[PDB]
Amino acid sequence: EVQLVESGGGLVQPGGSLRLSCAASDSSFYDYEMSWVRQVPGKTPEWIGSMYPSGRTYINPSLKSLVTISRDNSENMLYLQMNSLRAEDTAMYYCVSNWASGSTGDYWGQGTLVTVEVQLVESGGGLVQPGGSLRLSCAASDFYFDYYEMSWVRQAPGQGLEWVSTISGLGGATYYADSVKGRFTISRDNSKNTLYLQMNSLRAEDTALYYCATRSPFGDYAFSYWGQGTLVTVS
Amino acid sequence: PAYTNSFTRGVYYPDKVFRSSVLHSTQDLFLPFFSNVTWFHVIRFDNPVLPFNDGVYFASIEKSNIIRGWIFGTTLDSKTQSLLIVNNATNVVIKVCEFQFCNDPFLEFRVYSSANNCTFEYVSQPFLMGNFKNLREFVFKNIDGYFKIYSKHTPIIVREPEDLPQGFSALEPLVDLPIGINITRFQTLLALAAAYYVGYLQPRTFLLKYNENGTITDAVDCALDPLSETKCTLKSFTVEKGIYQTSNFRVQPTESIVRFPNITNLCPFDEVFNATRFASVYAWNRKRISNCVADYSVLYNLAPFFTFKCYGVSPTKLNDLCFTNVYADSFVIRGDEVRQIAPGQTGNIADYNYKLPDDFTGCVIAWNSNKLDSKVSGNYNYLYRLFRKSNLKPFERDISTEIYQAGNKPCNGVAGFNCYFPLRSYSFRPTYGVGHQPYRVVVLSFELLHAPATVCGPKKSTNLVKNKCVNFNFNGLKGTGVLTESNKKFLPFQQFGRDIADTTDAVRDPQTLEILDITPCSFGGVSVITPGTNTSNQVAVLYQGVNCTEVNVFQTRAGCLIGAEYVNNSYECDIPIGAGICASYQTSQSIIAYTMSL
């Protein structure tokens, strides 16, 4: 519930420093880049300034060397001191949390009108207790394709092979199968480039020979890279 | 009740296209050859209401035509719009209206009771066409709301076969009523030594041979004899010495099932196309479409976009291929490097702003227009990545404002000489060339996963049929066979041999959680040995050792064959049957199974 406040406005004389105040909603909404955009009546708004989270600011080359903004106190300080005021820039002003996600993730202000190398090794222990959680890991040496999709397929001898996990490389939404709905989940840690399968209470039918196979979401319907294999004897 | 032969009688034109010397093998409604059809002998009321399964092939050999009209209707109870043909003396009228036909099919307007809310009527003036008894034949059917009637009234010979004439015929399209009412029953109207020759146009696969003049020379039914089955496998009409296989021609598909989609409510696909100012160049949004139904028809006529350059997949037929997840991006770049959006391209925005993988089965879209934006004030709202010391990975966000360094020494965050910020603003003026126009490009990424389909095409959904040889196209995998409701849980995902030469065995229902086992209707490697139609018209079959008992036969280590006899003698190998054994054609004149002269 972002409820940032904006203050500062009213009658002003051409020539001076307009002191605004864009305060956050006492939260951590300053982790990304905020923006200050000016909107004139009867026309689309015009961007003015952009404050990046890494202690940086950027103004438009048109209105250059006439406006400054800085925090310098690790608090909600977005004064945006506009130097050399006039009557042409008199319009509507409102700060936005991020002017880079139009109509998708942006939150406008209220409004203040102014006047004037393919080794996919695996892990795992041995037998598993008849009912109980577990955890398996899969490492990827010399692998940087962060857009491929992952899966934990079970190819134990006897019956056929199945599909359980699905990690969208372009996305990240967890897609499970029908028999593993309330079962182990997956997580793609992009820091160390590994795969984590946090198991849960398994039954006698969960005994399999799960692998760690990755493939490309665009192209064919088969896999591209294999692993070494792990055994989970639930008995 | 009686049966008779209907050889080479019932072949018509499937469509109205006037081709020239083509090969037509469309599976439409036809009457198979040598079919036991009914022959009604009239001198009285002997012919009852005939069942209209899929069409009626009527015929009569007589002079001074007294059987001219035909009674159509669904139930003949004044419920649906029936059909009547009144051609008593000179006024031929085809009326599509509800007529209550009594028990007197003969004439003279006492056949019907009264009139009702009628419909369109054909005013065709051409008449429906002591020497001999001429032959008149007609074909009646109704498909796709078109009541097509075919006729090939031609002078017949003077009672040569006395049952049905020889030679091939092809009934030219007589008329085509645009009414779409359904007909289930069939009868006739007596206009008072004739004969009623009717049949059932059961669905099968037929092959025809057209000519440059318009007439059809040859036609094969592909369902009569193994030689007829083999003739429709080489796309020809003459055969010679050899042995050839078939593919599911002895059993023909009955219906067609698709069941592609399962959702009726559309998704907000237009929110990314028509909205306020989109994202910048250094940052790009990504909306993940979910369980929905895709309707690309509204994106074609409404809001005319630019060229639909689709890479990886076909640019058309996008209303049938269904995927699992479909991601929608957002972007706006200058109109001088948009060509770099294609996969495998390089440049400025394709190297440090947004990269594309080598395999991208999506499609780009653009609606460049400087009317919604680019006011005359000085445009510096959009920014783009200036430079990067490293290479960009495809499909990777670049939200970072680190001080870019390009000099011999690190700047340590001072923004000075050779320490420019990696984000530079853009300039989009409404008065400029084509190379400075804001292209609001969007790369719709279509990928396929192992998850159930969530958003398919806008087609309809048919009903599931159990224990029947039909065709099914669930998720692009077209298959002809029989679906069985089995208990083979844990759906197979066979990909060990990379599916080089292998077919599927079972599928999952895309509508509800179900398993459908796919079984071939009739197979087993049925190879027919044809010595050639020039010598005779007798062939034999052979199976590649499947069962030797299909649910004059000799037992060898190659299967079982029917239509020959084993000879203990040995001769020269002429036609290799299998496992070294060969056959020939010697005197009665037939084929034998002599031992190979080893």
mmCIF file of N, CA, C and O in Angstrom, chain B residues 32-33 202-207 220-230 232 249-252:
data_model
loop_
_atom_site.group_PDB
_atom_site.id
_atom_site.type_symbol
_atom_site.label_atom_id
_atom_site.label_comp_id
_atom_site.label_asym_id
_atom_site.label_seq_id
_atom_site.Cartn_x
_atom_site.Cartn_y
_atom_site.Cartn_z
ATOM 1 N N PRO B 32 -18.994 -47.172 -52.223
ATOM 2 C CA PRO B 32 -17.929 -48.112 -52.590
ATOM 3 C C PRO B 32 -18.350 -49.033 -53.721
ATOM 4 O O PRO B 32 -19.536 -49.294 -53.939
ATOM 5 N N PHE B 33 -17.352 -49.531 -54.447
ATOM 6 C CA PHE B 33 -17.601 -50.427 -55.565
ATOM 7 C C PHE B 33 -17.929 -51.828 -55.066
ATOM 8 O O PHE B 33 -17.519 -52.234 -53.974
ATOM 9 N N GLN B 202 -21.487 -44.047 -47.799
ATOM 10 C CA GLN B 202 -20.742 -44.126 -46.556
ATOM 11 C C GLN B 202 -19.366 -43.481 -46.716
ATOM 12 O O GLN B 202 -18.754 -43.560 -47.783
ATOM 13 N N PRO B 203 -18.860 -42.831 -45.667
ATOM 14 C CA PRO B 203 -17.599 -42.087 -45.798
ATOM 15 C C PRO B 203 -16.410 -43.021 -45.981
ATOM 16 O O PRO B 203 -16.191 -43.937 -45.186
ATOM 17 N N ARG B 204 -15.644 -42.775 -47.042
ATOM 18 C CA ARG B 204 -14.434 -43.533 -47.326
ATOM 19 C C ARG B 204 -13.490 -42.655 -48.135
ATOM 20 O O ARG B 204 -13.844 -41.555 -48.566
ATOM 21 N N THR B 205 -12.276 -43.158 -48.342
ATOM 22 C CA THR B 205 -11.244 -42.443 -49.080
ATOM 23 C C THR B 205 -11.247 -42.918 -50.528
ATOM 24 O O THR B 205 -10.974 -44.092 -50.800
ATOM 25 N N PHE B 206 -11.553 -42.009 -51.449
ATOM 26 C CA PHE B 206 -11.606 -42.316 -52.870
ATOM 27 C C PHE B 206 -10.573 -41.490 -53.621
ATOM 28 O O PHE B 206 -10.195 -40.394 -53.194
ATOM 29 N N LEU B 207 -10.116 -42.029 -54.749
ATOM 30 C CA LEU B 207 -9.128 -41.380 -55.598
ATOM 31 C C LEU B 207 -9.683 -41.254 -57.009
ATOM 32 O O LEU B 207 -10.320 -42.180 -57.516
ATOM 33 N N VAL B 220 -10.529 -44.965 -58.199
ATOM 34 C CA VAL B 220 -10.325 -46.121 -57.339
ATOM 35 C C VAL B 220 -10.986 -45.849 -55.996
ATOM 36 O O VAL B 220 -10.931 -44.733 -55.467
ATOM 37 N N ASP B 221 -11.617 -46.885 -55.441
ATOM 38 C CA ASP B 221 -12.334 -46.766 -54.178
ATOM 39 C C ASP B 221 -11.442 -46.957 -52.960
ATOM 40 O O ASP B 221 -11.836 -46.557 -51.857
ATOM 41 N N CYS B 222 -10.271 -47.574 -53.128
ATOM 42 C CA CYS B 222 -9.281 -47.763 -52.067
ATOM 43 C C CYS B 222 -9.807 -48.604 -50.907
ATOM 44 O O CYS B 222 -9.209 -48.615 -49.827
ATOM 45 N N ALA B 223 -10.926 -49.311 -51.098
ATOM 46 C CA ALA B 223 -11.486 -50.125 -50.027
ATOM 47 C C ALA B 223 -12.043 -51.457 -50.515
ATOM 48 O O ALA B 223 -12.676 -52.169 -49.725
ATOM 49 N N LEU B 224 -11.833 -51.820 -51.779
ATOM 50 C CA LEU B 224 -12.435 -53.027 -52.338
ATOM 51 C C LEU B 224 -11.556 -54.256 -52.121
ATOM 52 O O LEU B 224 -11.982 -55.229 -51.490
ATOM 53 N N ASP B 225 -10.338 -54.225 -52.638
ATOM 54 C CA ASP B 225 -9.428 -55.358 -52.598
ATOM 55 C C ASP B 225 -8.039 -54.859 -52.236
ATOM 56 O O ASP B 225 -7.745 -53.669 -52.385
ATOM 57 N N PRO B 226 -7.167 -55.743 -51.740
ATOM 58 C CA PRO B 226 -5.788 -55.322 -51.436
ATOM 59 C C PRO B 226 -5.083 -54.651 -52.602
ATOM 60 O O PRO B 226 -4.248 -53.764 -52.382
ATOM 61 N N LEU B 227 -5.394 -55.041 -53.841
ATOM 62 C CA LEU B 227 -4.850 -54.328 -54.991
ATOM 63 C C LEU B 227 -5.379 -52.899 -55.044
ATOM 64 O O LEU B 227 -4.638 -51.965 -55.371
ATOM 65 N N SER B 228 -6.660 -52.711 -54.716
ATOM 66 C CA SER B 228 -7.221 -51.365 -54.663
ATOM 67 C C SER B 228 -6.597 -50.555 -53.534
ATOM 68 O O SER B 228 -6.386 -49.345 -53.674
ATOM 69 N N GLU B 229 -6.299 -51.203 -52.406
ATOM 70 C CA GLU B 229 -5.616 -50.513 -51.315
ATOM 71 C C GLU B 229 -4.213 -50.091 -51.727
ATOM 72 O O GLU B 229 -3.772 -48.980 -51.411
ATOM 73 N N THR B 230 -3.496 -50.966 -52.436
ATOM 74 C CA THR B 230 -2.141 -50.642 -52.868
ATOM 75 C C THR B 230 -2.136 -49.563 -53.943
ATOM 76 O O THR B 230 -1.208 -48.747 -53.996
ATOM 77 N N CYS B 232 -3.902 -46.946 -54.179
ATOM 78 C CA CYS B 232 -4.053 -45.628 -53.580
ATOM 79 C C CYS B 232 -2.898 -45.267 -52.653
ATOM 80 O O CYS B 232 -3.019 -44.325 -51.862
ATOM 81 N N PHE B 249 -5.790 -48.008 -44.759
ATOM 82 C CA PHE B 249 -6.788 -47.798 -45.800
ATOM 83 C C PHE B 249 -7.925 -48.807 -45.758
ATOM 84 O O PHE B 249 -8.980 -48.551 -46.348
ATOM 85 N N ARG B 250 -7.741 -49.943 -45.081
ATOM 86 C CA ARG B 250 -8.826 -50.911 -44.966
ATOM 87 C C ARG B 250 -9.898 -50.437 -43.995
ATOM 88 O O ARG B 250 -11.064 -50.826 -44.123
ATOM 89 N N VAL B 251 -9.529 -49.606 -43.025
ATOM 90 C CA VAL B 251 -10.470 -49.005 -42.087
ATOM 91 C C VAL B 251 -10.379 -47.494 -42.247
ATOM 92 O O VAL B 251 -9.295 -46.915 -42.099
ATOM 93 N N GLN B 252 -11.509 -46.861 -42.550
ATOM 94 C CA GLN B 252 -11.438 -45.425 -42.778
ATOM 95 C C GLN B 252 -11.970 -44.654 -41.576
ATOM 96 O O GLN B 252 -12.936 -45.089 -40.940
#
